[PDB]
Amino acid sequence: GAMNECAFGTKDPVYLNFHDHVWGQPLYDSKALFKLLALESQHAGLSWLTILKKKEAYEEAFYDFEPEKVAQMTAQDIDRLMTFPNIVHHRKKLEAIVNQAQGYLKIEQAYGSFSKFLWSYVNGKPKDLQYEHASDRITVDDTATQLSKDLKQYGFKFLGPVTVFSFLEAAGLYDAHLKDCPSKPKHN
Ligand SMILES: Cn1cnc(N)c2ncnc1-2
Numbered sequence: 283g284a285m286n287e288c289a290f291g292t293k294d295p296v297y298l299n300f301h302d303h304v305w306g307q308p309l310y311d312s313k314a315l316f317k318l319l320a321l322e323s324q325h326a327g328l329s330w331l332t333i334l335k336k337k338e339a340y341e342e343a344f345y346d347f348e349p350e351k352v353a354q355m356t357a358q359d360i361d362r363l364m365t366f367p368n369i370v371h372h373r374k375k376l377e378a379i380v381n382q383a384q385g386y387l388k389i390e391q392a393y394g395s396f397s398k399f400l401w402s403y404v405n406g407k408p409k410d411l412q413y414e415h416a417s418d419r420i421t422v423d424d425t426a427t428q429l430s431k432d433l434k435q436y437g438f439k440f441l442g443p444v445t446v447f448s449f450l451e452a453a454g455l456y457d458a459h460l461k462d463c464p465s466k467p468k469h470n
């Protein structure tokens with residue numbers, strides 16, 4: 283049905299739980315946003331589900347994505363992470379997360395909260411993309427492009443326009459659920 287079309291054809295409970303409980307559901311917590319963004323930066327070259335199934339390994343490797351702690355991680359911490367089981371052993375991907383955490387802190391120093399900074403890009407309100415078929419879906423737009431460029435200036439890495447657009451969908455700043463998907467969030 284509509285769920286199968288919306289949820290990338292998966293019958294895997296982990297992916298289906300993510301589709302229903304996380305993907306496209308507006309997320310307002312600053313640290314939870316950082317975490318989702320950081321996981322997204324790890325995707326390129328792998329499947330998304332592959333990253334999802336490494337989430338717990340990442341949480342342990344990165345102090346549950348607590349930005350103050352992640353930002354303090356050293357070259358030596360990254361050396362250790364190169365053989366930490368079940369995270370992606372791609373040094374620059376891992377270093378990227380440390381740089382992201384640093385950028386997060388810079389943003390919060392300027393604007394008070396990472397959440398507020400992000401949500402400003404959709405004027406504080408989820409953008410219902412109003413899709414009806416999976417074939418309607420785009421992979422990048424002007425807003426994701428601008429956010430990507432702006433993040434880069436703060437030191438964020440591995441977060442190009444396409445990757446930032448996927449994160450917008452996942453964090454529910456964009457709702458990319460199909461109209462008849464049973465998990466489509468309600469909008470005011
Ligand atoms: C459902 N999905 C597919 N691909 C990605 N890169 C994703 N990121 C968050 N959610 C995603």
Ligand SMILES: [Zn+2]
Nearest residue numbers: 288459463465
């Ligand atoms: Zn859906």
